[PDB]
Coordinates of C-alpha atoms in Angstrom, one line a residue:
Chain A
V1 CA -18.5 -27.2 -1.9
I2 CA -15.7 -25.0 -3.2
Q3 CA -15.4 -25.8 -6.9
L4 CA -12.2 -24.6 -8.6
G5 CA -12.2 -27.1 -11.4
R6 CA -13.0 -24.7 -14.3
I7 CA -10.6 -22.0 -13.3
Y8 CA -7.9 -24.2 -11.8
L9 CA -5.3 -23.8 -14.6
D10 CA -6.3 -20.1 -14.9
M11 CA -5.3 -19.7 -11.2
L12 CA -1.9 -21.3 -11.6
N13 CA -1.2 -19.3 -14.7
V14 CA -2.0 -16.1 -12.8
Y15 CA 0.3 -17.5 -10.0
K16 CA 3.3 -18.1 -12.3
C17 CA 2.8 -14.7 -14.0
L18 CA 2.5 -12.8 -10.7
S19 CA 5.6 -14.7 -9.5
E20 CA 7.7 -13.4 -12.4
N21 CA 6.4 -9.9 -11.8
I22 CA 7.5 -10.2 -8.2
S23 CA 10.9 -11.7 -9.0
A24 CA 11.6 -9.2 -11.7
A25 CA 10.8 -6.3 -9.3
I26 CA 13.2 -7.8 -6.8
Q27 CA 16.0 -8.7 -9.2
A28 CA 16.0 -5.0 -10.1
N29 CA 15.2 -3.1 -6.9
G30 CA 16.0 -5.4 -3.9
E31 CA 13.7 -6.6 -1.2
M32 CA 12.4 -3.2 -0.1
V33 CA 10.1 -3.8 -3.1
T34 CA 8.0 -6.3 -1.1
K35 CA 6.6 -3.4 0.9
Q36 CA 5.1 -1.6 -2.0
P37 CA 1.2 -1.8 -2.1
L38 CA 1.1 -3.6 -5.5
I39 CA 3.8 -6.2 -4.8
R40 CA 1.9 -6.9 -1.5
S41 CA -1.3 -7.4 -3.5
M42 CA 0.5 -9.8 -5.8
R43 CA 1.9 -11.7 -2.9
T44 CA -1.6 -11.9 -1.4
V45 CA -3.1 -13.4 -4.6
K46 CA -0.4 -16.0 -4.6
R47 CA -1.0 -16.8 -1.0
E48 CA -4.8 -16.9 -1.1
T49 CA -4.6 -18.9 -4.3
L50 CA -2.7 -21.7 -2.5
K51 CA -5.2 -21.6 0.4
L52 CA -8.1 -22.0 -2.0
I53 CA -6.4 -24.8 -4.0
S54 CA -5.5 -26.4 -0.6
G55 CA -9.1 -26.4 0.6
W56 CA -10.3 -27.7 -2.7
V57 CA -7.9 -30.6 -2.6
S58 CA -8.5 -31.4 1.1
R59 CA -12.1 -32.1 0.2
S60 CA -11.8 -34.1 -3.0
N61 CA -12.7 -37.9 -3.2
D62 CA -10.5 -39.3 -6.0
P63 CA -6.9 -39.3 -4.8
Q64 CA -5.4 -41.0 -7.9
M65 CA -7.2 -38.5 -10.2
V66 CA -6.0 -35.5 -8.2
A67 CA -2.5 -36.9 -8.0
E68 CA -2.3 -37.4 -11.8
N69 CA -4.1 -34.4 -13.1
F70 CA -3.8 -31.6 -10.5
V71 CA -0.6 -32.1 -8.6
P72 CA 1.7 -32.0 -11.6
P73 CA 0.7 -28.5 -12.7
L74 CA 0.7 -27.3 -9.1
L75 CA 4.3 -28.4 -8.4
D76 CA 5.3 -26.9 -11.7
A77 CA 3.9 -23.5 -10.7
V78 CA 5.2 -23.4 -7.1
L79 CA 8.3 -25.5 -6.5
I80 CA 11.2 -23.9 -8.4
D81 CA 9.7 -20.5 -7.8
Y82 CA 10.0 -21.1 -4.0
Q83 CA 13.5 -22.4 -4.3
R84 CA 15.1 -19.7 -6.4
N85 CA 13.7 -16.7 -4.4
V86 CA 15.0 -14.7 -1.5
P87 CA 13.6 -15.9 1.8
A88 CA 11.7 -12.6 2.2
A89 CA 9.8 -13.6 -1.0
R90 CA 8.9 -17.3 -0.3
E91 CA 5.3 -17.8 0.5
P92 CA 5.0 -20.1 3.6
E93 CA 1.6 -21.3 2.2
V94 CA 3.6 -23.3 -0.3
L95 CA 4.9 -25.5 2.5
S96 CA 1.4 -25.9 4.1
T97 CA -0.1 -26.6 0.6
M98 CA 2.4 -29.5 0.2
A99 CA 1.6 -30.9 3.6
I100 CA -2.1 -30.8 2.7
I101 CA -1.7 -32.7 -0.6
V102 CA 0.5 -35.3 1.2
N103 CA -2.1 -35.8 4.0
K104 CA -4.7 -36.2 1.4
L105 CA -2.9 -38.2 -1.3
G106 CA -0.2 -40.1 0.6
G107 CA 1.1 -43.0 -1.5
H108 CA -0.3 -41.5 -4.6
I109 CA 2.4 -38.8 -4.6
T110 CA 5.2 -40.6 -2.7
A111 CA 7.2 -40.5 -6.0
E112 CA 6.8 -36.7 -6.0
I113 CA 8.4 -36.1 -2.6
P114 CA 12.0 -36.1 -3.8
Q115 CA 11.2 -33.4 -6.3
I116 CA 9.4 -31.4 -3.5
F117 CA 12.2 -31.8 -1.0
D118 CA 14.9 -30.8 -3.5
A119 CA 12.9 -27.6 -4.0
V120 CA 11.9 -26.5 -0.5
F121 CA 13.7 -28.6 2.1
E122 CA 17.2 -27.2 2.6
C123 CA 16.5 -23.6 1.8
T124 CA 13.5 -23.6 4.2
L125 CA 15.7 -25.2 6.9
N126 CA 18.4 -22.5 6.6
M127 CA 15.7 -20.0 7.1
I128 CA 14.4 -21.4 10.4
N129 CA 17.4 -23.1 12.1
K130 CA 18.7 -19.6 12.9
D131 CA 18.0 -19.2 16.6
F132 CA 16.4 -15.8 15.9
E133 CA 12.7 -16.7 15.6
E134 CA 12.6 -15.3 12.1
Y135 CA 10.2 -16.8 9.6
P136 CA 8.1 -18.4 12.4
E137 CA 5.3 -19.3 9.9
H138 CA 7.7 -21.3 7.6
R139 CA 9.0 -23.1 10.7
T140 CA 5.5 -24.2 11.5
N141 CA 4.6 -25.3 7.9
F142 CA 8.0 -27.0 7.6
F143 CA 7.2 -29.4 10.4
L144 CA 3.6 -29.9 9.3
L145 CA 5.1 -31.0 5.9
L146 CA 7.7 -33.2 7.6
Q147 CA 5.0 -34.8 9.8
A148 CA 3.0 -35.5 6.7
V149 CA 5.7 -37.2 4.7
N150 CA 6.6 -39.2 7.7
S151 CA 3.0 -40.3 8.1
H152 CA 1.8 -41.1 4.6
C153 CA 4.9 -41.2 2.3
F154 CA 7.5 -42.7 4.6
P155 CA 9.2 -44.7 1.8
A156 CA 10.3 -41.3 0.3
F157 CA 12.7 -40.9 3.2
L158 CA 14.7 -43.9 1.9
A159 CA 14.4 -42.6 -1.6
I160 CA 16.1 -39.2 -1.1
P161 CA 19.9 -38.9 -0.8
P162 CA 21.1 -40.2 2.6
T163 CA 22.8 -36.9 3.0
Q164 CA 19.4 -35.2 2.7
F165 CA 17.8 -37.6 5.2
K166 CA 20.6 -36.7 7.6
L167 CA 19.3 -33.1 7.5
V168 CA 15.8 -34.4 8.2
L169 CA 17.0 -35.9 11.4
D170 CA 19.0 -32.7 12.1
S171 CA 15.9 -30.6 11.9
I172 CA 14.0 -33.0 14.2
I173 CA 16.8 -32.9 16.7
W174 CA 17.0 -29.1 16.4
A175 CA 13.2 -28.9 16.9
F176 CA 13.0 -31.0 20.1
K177 CA 15.9 -29.0 21.4
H178 CA 14.0 -25.7 20.9
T179 CA 13.1 -23.5 23.9
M180 CA 9.6 -23.1 22.6
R181 CA 8.0 -25.8 24.3
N182 CA 5.5 -25.9 21.3
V183 CA 8.1 -26.6 18.6
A184 CA 10.0 -29.1 20.8
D185 CA 6.9 -31.3 21.2
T186 CA 6.2 -31.4 17.5
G187 CA 9.8 -32.6 17.1
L188 CA 9.3 -35.3 19.8
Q189 CA 6.1 -36.3 18.2
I190 CA 7.8 -36.6 14.8
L191 CA 10.7 -38.5 16.2
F192 CA 8.4 -41.0 18.0
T193 CA 6.4 -41.7 14.8
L194 CA 9.6 -41.9 12.7
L195 CA 11.1 -44.6 15.0
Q196 CA 8.0 -46.6 14.6
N197 CA 7.9 -46.3 10.9
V198 CA 11.5 -47.3 10.8
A199 CA 10.7 -50.6 12.6
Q200 CA 8.3 -51.4 9.8
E201 CA 11.1 -51.2 7.2
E202 CA 12.9 -54.3 8.4
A203 CA 14.9 -54.1 5.2
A204 CA 16.4 -50.7 6.2
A205 CA 15.9 -50.6 10.0
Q206 CA 19.3 -51.9 10.9
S207 CA 21.2 -49.4 8.8
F208 CA 19.2 -46.7 10.5
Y209 CA 19.9 -48.0 14.0
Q210 CA 23.5 -48.5 13.2
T211 CA 23.7 -44.9 11.9
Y212 CA 21.3 -42.9 14.1
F213 CA 20.3 -44.9 17.3
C214 CA 23.1 -43.7 19.6
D215 CA 23.0 -40.2 18.2
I216 CA 19.3 -39.7 18.9
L217 CA 19.7 -41.3 22.3
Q218 CA 22.6 -38.9 23.1
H219 CA 20.6 -35.9 22.1
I220 CA 17.4 -36.9 24.0
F221 CA 19.5 -37.3 27.1
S222 CA 21.2 -34.0 26.6
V223 CA 17.8 -32.4 26.7
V224 CA 16.6 -34.2 29.8
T225 CA 20.0 -33.6 31.4
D226 CA 19.5 -29.8 30.8
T227 CA 18.6 -28.1 34.1
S228 CA 15.2 -26.6 34.3
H229 CA 13.3 -28.2 31.4
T230 CA 10.9 -30.8 32.7
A231 CA 9.0 -29.7 29.6
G232 CA 8.2 -32.7 27.5
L233 CA 9.6 -35.1 30.0
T234 CA 6.7 -37.3 29.3
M235 CA 7.6 -37.7 25.6
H236 CA 11.4 -38.1 26.4
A237 CA 10.5 -41.0 28.7
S238 CA 8.2 -42.3 26.0
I239 CA 10.9 -42.2 23.4
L240 CA 13.7 -43.5 25.7
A241 CA 11.5 -46.3 27.0
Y242 CA 10.8 -47.3 23.4
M243 CA 14.5 -47.2 22.4
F244 CA 15.7 -49.1 25.5
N245 CA 13.0 -51.7 24.9
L246 CA 14.2 -52.2 21.3
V247 CA 17.6 -53.2 22.7
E248 CA 16.3 -55.4 25.4
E249 CA 14.1 -57.3 23.0
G250 CA 16.9 -57.7 20.5
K251 CA 15.2 -55.8 17.7
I252 CA 18.6 -54.3 16.8
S253 CA 20.4 -57.3 15.3
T254 CA 23.3 -55.3 14.0
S255 CA 26.1 -54.5 16.5
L256 CA 25.8 -50.7 17.2
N257 CA 29.4 -50.7 18.3
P258 CA 31.0 -52.4 15.3
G259 CA 34.3 -51.5 16.9
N260 CA 34.0 -53.7 19.9
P261 CA 31.1 -56.0 18.8
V262 CA 29.6 -57.1 22.1
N263 CA 26.0 -57.3 23.2
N264 CA 24.1 -54.1 22.4
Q265 CA 22.8 -54.3 26.0
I266 CA 26.3 -54.4 27.5
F267 CA 27.5 -51.7 25.1
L268 CA 24.4 -49.5 25.6
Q269 CA 24.8 -49.7 29.4
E270 CA 28.4 -48.5 29.2
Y271 CA 27.5 -46.0 26.5
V272 CA 24.8 -44.3 28.5
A273 CA 26.8 -44.6 31.7
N274 CA 29.7 -42.7 30.1
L275 CA 27.4 -40.0 28.8
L276 CA 26.2 -39.4 32.3
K277 CA 29.6 -39.7 33.9
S278 CA 30.9 -37.1 31.4
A279 CA 28.1 -34.6 31.8
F280 CA 28.4 -35.1 35.6
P281 CA 31.8 -36.4 36.8
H282 CA 30.6 -35.7 40.3
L283 CA 28.1 -38.6 40.0
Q284 CA 29.2 -41.8 41.9
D285 CA 30.1 -44.6 39.5
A286 CA 28.0 -47.4 41.0
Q287 CA 24.9 -45.2 41.3
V288 CA 25.1 -44.3 37.6
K289 CA 25.2 -48.0 36.9
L290 CA 22.0 -48.5 39.0
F291 CA 20.2 -45.7 37.2
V292 CA 21.0 -47.2 33.8
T293 CA 19.9 -50.7 34.9
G294 CA 16.5 -49.2 35.9
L295 CA 16.1 -47.8 32.4
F296 CA 15.8 -51.3 31.0
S297 CA 13.9 -52.4 34.2
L298 CA 11.2 -49.9 33.6
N299 CA 11.2 -49.8 29.8
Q300 CA 7.6 -51.0 29.6
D301 CA 6.0 -48.7 32.3
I302 CA 6.3 -45.2 30.9
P303 CA 4.9 -43.5 34.1
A304 CA 7.4 -45.4 36.2
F305 CA 10.2 -44.7 33.6
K306 CA 9.3 -41.0 33.7
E307 CA 9.5 -40.9 37.5
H308 CA 12.8 -42.8 37.4
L309 CA 14.2 -40.1 35.2
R310 CA 12.7 -37.3 37.4
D311 CA 14.3 -38.7 40.5
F312 CA 17.7 -38.8 38.8
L313 CA 17.4 -35.1 38.0
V314 CA 16.9 -34.5 41.7
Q315 CA 20.0 -36.5 42.4
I316 CA 21.8 -33.8 40.4
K317 CA 20.0 -30.5 41.0
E318 CA 20.2 -31.0 44.8
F319 CA 23.9 -31.6 44.5
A320 CA 24.1 -28.2 42.8
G321 CA 21.4 -25.8 43.9
Chain B
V1 CA 6.0 -2.3 -14.1
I2 CA 2.9 -4.5 -13.4
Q3 CA 2.4 -6.6 -16.6
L4 CA -1.2 -7.8 -16.5
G5 CA -1.7 -8.1 -20.2
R6 CA -0.7 -11.8 -20.0
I7 CA -3.3 -12.7 -17.4
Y8 CA -6.1 -10.1 -17.5
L9 CA -8.5 -12.6 -19.2
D10 CA -7.6 -15.2 -16.6
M11 CA -8.0 -12.8 -13.7
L12 CA -11.5 -11.8 -14.7
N13 CA -12.4 -15.4 -15.2
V14 CA -11.3 -16.3 -11.7
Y15 CA -13.1 -13.3 -10.4
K16 CA -16.3 -14.4 -12.0
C17 CA -16.0 -18.0 -10.8
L18 CA -15.2 -17.0 -7.3
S19 CA -18.1 -14.7 -7.2
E20 CA -20.4 -17.6 -8.1
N21 CA -18.8 -19.7 -5.4
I22 CA -19.5 -16.9 -2.9
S23 CA -23.1 -16.3 -4.2
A24 CA -23.9 -20.0 -4.0
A25 CA -22.5 -20.2 -0.5
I26 CA -24.7 -17.3 0.6
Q27 CA -27.9 -18.0 -1.4
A28 CA -27.8 -21.4 0.3
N29 CA -26.5 -20.9 3.8
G30 CA -27.0 -17.3 4.7
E31 CA -24.6 -14.3 5.2
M32 CA -22.9 -16.0 8.1
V33 CA -20.9 -17.9 5.4
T34 CA -18.8 -14.8 4.7
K35 CA -16.9 -15.4 7.9
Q36 CA -15.6 -18.8 6.9
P37 CA -11.9 -19.0 6.0
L38 CA -12.4 -20.1 2.4
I39 CA -15.1 -17.6 1.5
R40 CA -12.9 -14.9 3.0
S41 CA -10.0 -16.1 0.8
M42 CA -12.2 -15.8 -2.3
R43 CA -13.3 -12.3 -1.3
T44 CA -9.7 -11.3 -0.8
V45 CA -8.6 -12.6 -4.2
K46 CA -11.5 -10.7 -5.7
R47 CA -10.4 -7.5 -3.8
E48 CA -6.7 -7.8 -4.7
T49 CA -7.6 -8.5 -8.3
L50 CA -9.4 -5.1 -8.5
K51 CA -6.5 -3.4 -6.8
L52 CA -4.0 -4.8 -9.2
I53 CA -6.2 -3.9 -12.2
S54 CA -6.8 -0.4 -10.8
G55 CA -3.0 0.1 -10.4
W56 CA -2.4 -1.2 -13.9
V57 CA -5.0 1.1 -15.5
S58 CA -3.8 4.1 -13.5
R59 CA -0.4 3.8 -15.2
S60 CA -1.6 3.0 -18.7
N61 CA -0.9 5.5 -21.5
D62 CA -3.6 4.9 -24.2
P63 CA -7.0 5.9 -22.7
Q64 CA -9.0 5.1 -25.8
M65 CA -7.4 1.7 -26.2
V66 CA -8.0 0.9 -22.5
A67 CA -11.7 2.0 -22.7
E68 CA -12.4 0.0 -25.9
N69 CA -10.5 -3.1 -24.8
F70 CA -10.2 -3.5 -21.1
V71 CA -13.1 -1.6 -19.6
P72 CA -15.9 -3.7 -21.2
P73 CA -14.8 -7.1 -19.9
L74 CA -14.1 -5.6 -16.5
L75 CA -17.6 -4.1 -16.2
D76 CA -19.1 -7.4 -17.4
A77 CA -17.4 -9.2 -14.5
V78 CA -18.0 -6.6 -11.7
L79 CA -21.1 -4.5 -12.2
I80 CA -24.0 -7.0 -11.9
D81 CA -22.2 -9.1 -9.4
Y82 CA -22.0 -6.0 -7.1
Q83 CA -25.6 -4.9 -7.6
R84 CA -27.3 -8.3 -7.1
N85 CA -25.3 -9.2 -4.0
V86 CA -26.1 -8.8 -0.3
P87 CA -24.4 -5.7 1.2
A88 CA -22.1 -7.8 3.4
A89 CA -20.7 -9.3 0.1
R90 CA -20.4 -6.2 -2.1
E91 CA -16.7 -5.4 -2.4
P92 CA -16.1 -1.7 -1.9
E93 CA -13.0 -1.9 -4.1
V94 CA -15.5 -2.1 -7.0
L95 CA -16.4 1.5 -6.3
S96 CA -12.8 2.6 -6.0
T97 CA -11.8 0.8 -9.2
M98 CA -14.6 2.6 -11.1
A99 CA -13.3 5.9 -9.7
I100 CA -9.8 5.1 -10.9
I101 CA -10.9 4.3 -14.4
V102 CA -13.1 7.4 -14.6
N103 CA -10.2 9.6 -13.3
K104 CA -7.9 8.0 -15.9
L105 CA -10.1 7.6 -18.9
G106 CA -12.5 10.5 -18.5
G107 CA -14.6 11.2 -21.7
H108 CA -13.5 7.9 -23.2
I109 CA -15.9 6.1 -20.9
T110 CA -18.6 8.8 -20.4
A111 CA -20.9 6.5 -22.4
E112 CA -20.4 3.8 -19.7
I113 CA -21.4 5.9 -16.7
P114 CA -25.1 5.2 -17.0
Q115 CA -24.4 1.4 -17.0
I116 CA -22.1 1.8 -13.9
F117 CA -24.5 4.0 -12.0
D118 CA -27.4 1.6 -12.6
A119 CA -25.4 -1.2 -11.0
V120 CA -23.7 0.6 -8.1
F121 CA -25.3 3.9 -7.3
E122 CA -28.6 3.4 -5.4
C123 CA -27.8 0.1 -3.8
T124 CA -24.6 1.7 -2.4
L125 CA -26.3 4.9 -1.4
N126 CA -28.9 2.9 0.6
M127 CA -26.0 1.2 2.4
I128 CA -24.4 4.4 3.5
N129 CA -27.1 7.1 4.0
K130 CA -28.2 5.1 7.1
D131 CA -27.0 7.5 9.8
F132 CA -25.2 4.5 11.4
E133 CA -21.5 4.5 10.3
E134 CA -21.8 1.2 8.5
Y135 CA -19.9 0.3 5.4
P136 CA -17.5 3.3 6.0
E137 CA -15.3 2.1 3.1
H138 CA -18.2 1.9 0.6
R139 CA -19.1 5.4 1.7
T140 CA -15.6 6.8 1.0
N141 CA -15.4 5.0 -2.3
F142 CA -18.9 6.1 -3.3
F143 CA -17.9 9.8 -3.1
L144 CA -14.5 9.2 -4.8
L145 CA -16.5 7.8 -7.7
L146 CA -19.0 10.6 -7.6
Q147 CA -16.2 13.1 -7.7
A148 CA -14.5 11.4 -10.6
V149 CA -17.6 11.5 -12.8
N150 CA -18.3 15.1 -11.7
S151 CA -14.7 16.1 -12.7
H152 CA -14.2 14.1 -15.9
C153 CA -17.6 12.7 -17.1
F154 CA -19.9 15.6 -16.2
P155 CA -22.1 15.2 -19.3
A156 CA -23.2 11.8 -18.0
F157 CA -25.1 13.6 -15.2
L158 CA -27.3 14.9 -17.9
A159 CA -27.6 11.5 -19.6
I160 CA -28.9 9.5 -16.6
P161 CA -32.6 9.8 -15.8
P162 CA -33.5 13.0 -14.0
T163 CA -34.8 11.1 -11.0
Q164 CA -31.4 9.5 -10.7
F165 CA -29.7 12.8 -11.1
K166 CA -31.8 13.9 -8.2
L167 CA -30.4 11.1 -6.0
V168 CA -27.0 12.4 -7.0
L169 CA -27.7 15.8 -5.4
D170 CA -29.5 14.2 -2.4
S171 CA -26.3 12.3 -1.6
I172 CA -24.2 15.4 -2.0
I173 CA -26.5 17.3 0.4
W174 CA -26.6 14.4 2.7
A175 CA -22.8 14.4 2.9
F176 CA -22.2 18.1 3.6
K177 CA -25.0 17.8 6.2
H178 CA -23.0 15.0 7.9
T179 CA -21.4 15.1 11.3
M180 CA -18.0 13.9 10.1
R181 CA -16.0 16.9 8.9
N182 CA -14.2 14.6 6.4
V183 CA -17.4 13.6 4.7
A184 CA -18.9 17.1 4.8
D185 CA -16.0 18.6 3.0
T186 CA -16.1 16.0 0.3
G187 CA -19.7 16.9 -0.2
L188 CA -19.0 20.6 -0.3
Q189 CA -16.0 20.1 -2.6
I190 CA -18.2 18.1 -5.0
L191 CA -21.0 20.6 -4.8
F192 CA -18.7 23.5 -5.6
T193 CA -17.3 21.7 -8.6
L194 CA -20.7 20.6 -9.9
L195 CA -22.0 24.1 -9.8
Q196 CA -19.0 25.3 -11.9
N197 CA -19.5 22.3 -14.2
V198 CA -23.1 23.3 -14.7
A199 CA -22.1 26.8 -15.7
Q200 CA -20.2 25.4 -18.7
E201 CA -23.4 23.5 -19.8
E202 CA -25.2 26.6 -21.0
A203 CA -28.1 24.6 -22.5
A204 CA -28.8 22.5 -19.4
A205 CA -27.6 25.3 -17.0
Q206 CA -30.9 27.1 -16.8
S207 CA -32.9 23.9 -16.2
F208 CA -30.6 23.1 -13.3
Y209 CA -30.9 26.5 -11.7
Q210 CA -34.7 26.4 -12.2
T211 CA -34.9 23.0 -10.5
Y212 CA -32.1 23.1 -7.8
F213 CA -30.7 26.6 -7.2
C214 CA -33.1 27.5 -4.4
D215 CA -33.0 24.0 -2.8
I216 CA -29.2 23.9 -2.6
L217 CA -29.2 27.5 -1.2
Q218 CA -31.7 26.5 1.5
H219 CA -29.7 23.4 2.5
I220 CA -26.4 25.3 2.8
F221 CA -28.0 27.9 5.0
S222 CA -29.6 25.2 7.1
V223 CA -26.1 24.0 7.9
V224 CA -24.5 27.5 8.4
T225 CA -27.5 28.3 10.6
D226 CA -27.0 25.2 12.7
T227 CA -25.7 26.1 16.2
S228 CA -22.2 24.6 16.8
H229 CA -21.1 23.6 13.3
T230 CA -18.5 26.2 12.2
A231 CA -17.0 23.3 10.4
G232 CA -16.6 24.1 6.7
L233 CA -17.7 27.8 7.0
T234 CA -15.0 28.7 4.5
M235 CA -16.6 26.4 1.9
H236 CA -20.2 27.5 2.8
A237 CA -19.1 31.1 2.2
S238 CA -17.3 30.1 -1.0
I239 CA -20.4 28.4 -2.4
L240 CA -23.0 31.0 -1.2
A241 CA -20.7 33.8 -2.5
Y242 CA -20.6 32.0 -5.9
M243 CA -24.3 31.5 -6.0
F244 CA -25.2 35.1 -5.1
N245 CA -22.7 36.3 -7.6
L246 CA -24.4 34.3 -10.4
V247 CA -27.7 36.0 -9.6
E248 CA -26.2 39.5 -9.4
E249 CA -24.4 39.0 -12.7
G250 CA -27.7 37.9 -14.3
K251 CA -26.3 34.5 -15.2
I252 CA -29.6 32.9 -14.2
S253 CA -31.6 34.2 -17.2
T254 CA -34.6 32.0 -16.4
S255 CA -37.0 33.2 -13.7
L256 CA -36.4 31.2 -10.6
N257 CA -39.9 32.0 -9.3
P258 CA -42.1 31.1 -12.3
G259 CA -45.1 31.8 -10.0
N260 CA -44.5 35.5 -9.4
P261 CA -41.9 36.3 -12.2
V262 CA -39.9 39.2 -10.9
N263 CA -36.2 40.0 -10.7
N264 CA -34.2 37.0 -9.5
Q265 CA -32.5 39.6 -7.3
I266 CA -35.8 40.8 -5.8
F267 CA -37.1 37.3 -5.3
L268 CA -33.9 35.9 -4.0
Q269 CA -33.7 38.7 -1.4
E270 CA -37.2 37.9 -0.1
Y271 CA -36.5 34.2 -0.4
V272 CA -33.4 34.2 1.9
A273 CA -35.1 36.9 4.1
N274 CA -38.1 34.6 4.7
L275 CA -35.9 31.5 5.2
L276 CA -34.1 33.3 8.0
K277 CA -37.4 34.7 9.4
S278 CA -39.1 31.3 9.5
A279 CA -36.1 29.7 11.2
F280 CA -35.7 32.6 13.5
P281 CA -38.9 34.6 14.1
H282 CA -37.1 36.6 16.8
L283 CA -35.1 38.5 14.2
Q284 CA -36.0 42.0 13.1
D285 CA -37.1 42.4 9.5
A286 CA -34.8 45.4 8.8
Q287 CA -31.9 43.7 10.4
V288 CA -32.5 40.5 8.3
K289 CA -32.9 42.6 5.2
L290 CA -29.6 44.3 5.8
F291 CA -27.8 40.9 6.4
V292 CA -29.2 39.8 3.0
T293 CA -28.1 42.9 1.1
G294 CA -24.7 42.3 2.5
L295 CA -24.7 38.9 0.8
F296 CA -24.7 40.5 -2.6
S297 CA -22.4 43.3 -1.4
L298 CA -19.6 41.0 -0.4
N299 CA -20.2 38.2 -3.0
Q300 CA -16.7 38.8 -4.4
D301 CA -14.7 38.9 -1.2
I302 CA -15.0 35.5 0.4
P303 CA -13.0 36.3 3.5
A304 CA -15.4 39.3 4.0
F305 CA -18.3 37.1 3.1
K306 CA -17.3 34.5 5.6
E307 CA -16.9 37.1 8.4
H308 CA -20.3 38.5 7.4
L309 CA -21.8 35.0 8.1
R310 CA -19.8 34.5 11.2
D311 CA -21.0 37.9 12.6
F312 CA -24.6 37.0 11.8
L313 CA -24.4 33.7 13.7
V314 CA -23.5 35.7 16.8
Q315 CA -26.5 38.0 16.2
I316 CA -28.5 34.8 16.8
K317 CA -26.4 32.7 19.2
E318 CA -26.0 35.3 22.0
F319 CA -29.8 35.7 21.9
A320 CA -29.7 32.2 23.5
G321 CA -26.3 31.6 25.2

């Protein structure tokens, strides 16, 4: 019932003008500025403005209309302002607002994603991939946004520069490798969905597998291999089972190992075997082979697959402590 | 360096549209609404808007220009919206904003005080005078505004209707009779300043004395008289000293007691004497009479006057415990 229609442009105008007031105060007096009562008020109005615009958009019922008339002026007021400002001055509500228009408009704004990523993707990433849990709110909204593009504007991932997509996977990997069991599971959730969306893009699926399949596999295993971290074992099994099943069912037509083009099954078996032999040279060769065989054997029974993994971590922990 | 000129119009426009959004949500679904995230965001934007405007006005440098060009639209957007709303939806920053413009513009907006008081005085007063410490922020801002007007737009107190001017005094009395030292001293400080302001209004001065002098005197004593309440004794002494000095110097030309027109000195002596006798029938007439004479004797030595009062409390206290 929130109606912002008649003051919508007025709100964006106030937003842009307050942004400049904030920048100017920073370009002249540093970040300490951000603590002054009035600069805080200006930040608040920018923040609450996005929340209101977000709630207004999340309950509209004419996606094309919103996409053509409201989104353009919104991106004009928030994108470049977020990109060119010091981290201490970027409103995290800008990321959450993008996520909200994506979940609401999907395909109607897919063409807009590149423009949005160029403005908030890499700079936001550099703010959160720093171990130190600084900018926890941006980290949250970052993944809400990524989860949204992945869900309703998937094509955009192929649209952006391959080098940028590489960073997309890097943040996902970084996320499911995080100690905060909450972040890690959003990463695994994103990774699972992404792999499924990739399978729908038969045109580009092979390039993806060829480029990222083994990498992703290696990283997932590095996490399950890590002592004391049964956290998310369910999703690891879920993802691994899915990936192994793709190979067994011959969904990956390209030869993952272009070097020595053999069966992906044969290559994958050796590949995973080596990963494990390396991480644990103490492991008996024939037992590693049996463990890997079971990964394909149980690739369609997640609960069984999970237990299979669990048992193997005991055939390692016990051999240590 | 807050440059609102560019967006002032827009800000007031958003303020007005959000108010309507809030009113509609309330006047349709009860007060409970005010707790919803979006209604809160609206309220916050309205609040920060006033803070930004207040801060901008406080650093302006052309009082006349501001009063003729910025105050009118501001009052159009905030006054009636404040008055006709439910207490739970009246922004206390409206009161503080009014105080700031009064303290900055003074006589340039004296003509607007009547309009401001009609919109925020009584409704606010009724919100705070309820013993229960509710709306503690409105209360604080209420007196900040009252002080502003008293200090810079005194004449207005003569312009508003006498019945309203009587509510002004009632609230000042109510405040210095409060349990909170903080509130009480604000009341005493306002009272002292208003008494002085009245002295400069020769024409209206006599009318004031004739109507309020004895009442004020009685209320002050009722507080000084109260057991366990040494709080603000210095101010009580300062005010009483001032009042008795006015009478001794014949500044009150009109006859306080129109009934039995005698010397204000003679009448005032009996007046305070009886006040004390009624409240404390256990006091000796001659002892009371001496205490009163001492009030004129020391009316120009506040420290001595204060000690005079302190000693009299003991010539009452110990007679109990």
